[PDB]
């Protein structure tokens, strides 16, 4: 487990001015303080820190990784490799886990939505509609943290099952604000909290497709 | 170097719009 | 079609010559710390404004 | 006074011709419209989404070509997958820079 913290300063004249004008500064500073902790937690989950030896989601050693052919090569888009790769990734989880676990969630970059919108060569429905019809139960969603997974611009896709027994994030102590410690005609309010990161418990329920 | 300006100041003909804009910072 | 495709507002009175609107934002950070710490990051805020005729 | 087309802090996209000399490309229009719709949402990060489109009154003819082997047209499919957006044409977009340069506003 780990621990975080930050702080903020304010004076007395600023407090009196904020009271008399209807635009407090303390609330804005506290909002910034809380936002900073939330963003640091997100950074720990999705990127990890090297000196502290924290491993990101994409750098876990014992998970399934599949290299892929570009869904968008230079500029041409390939609707038919995406479906094949998704079906193969769905089958892999069931085959490896031997029927105990099945995929329930998919996360794609917000350009693969454009990719999966081309109409099927026949009829009018898109590839997404046919995929949902033949793969009922799976929910598809897109996040913007999957477009720069390594730092050199290579998009990735995650297929996994969501269950608190396979993966977990924990916050043993929430955001707290210690009482202000006054100085000469001004104060200092410290803040702190704790976080753990992401731990994968049965690292065979996640499949990563790299290079999309 | 005397004063020649008009009767009405620049703040008697001026309107501050009610809304203000705040930027959004999604957590993730 | 200038009036049809763009919104029309009625805030300004006939005698006004100018108007103004303001915006705000925020700045801050955080770090992983240990106990017995005196170095802690700080936050702040800032605004701006613009005019018209 | 700054016009709509000459304002500095707006997003501008250079496009390949929808009608080169005399040949019509009905597949570049859909790609460019989708890209322009995506840029607003990505930059404003979900607060703002495109709701209206204004095209020249001849690209209206362009977007009427029927699908190669279907009953629907490109406009119908675009509207079906992009519900909520209204497309309209105005004659003021047939000359933007004063030397015959058409444009589209999203």
Numbering used by the authors:
A (entry chain F): 108 to 319
B (entry chain F): 27 to 54
C (entry chain E): 55 to 107
D (entry chain E): 161 to 266
Paper lines:
Siphophages possess a long, flexible, and non-contractile tail that plays a crucial role in host recognition, cell envelope penetration, and DNA injection. Connected to the head through a connector complex, the tail of a siphophage consists of three main components: a tail tube, a tape measure protein (TMP), and a distal tip. Using cryo-EM, we resolved the three-dimensional (3D) structures of the icosahedral head, head–tail complex and the tail tip of a laboratory-adapted fiberless mature T1 at resolutions of 3.5 Å, 3.6 Å, and 4.3 Å, respectively.
The T1 head comprises 415 copies of the major capsid protein gp47, arranged into an icosahedron with a triangulation number of seven, decorated with 80 homologous trimers and 60 heterotrimers along the threefold and quasi-threefold axes of the icosahedron.
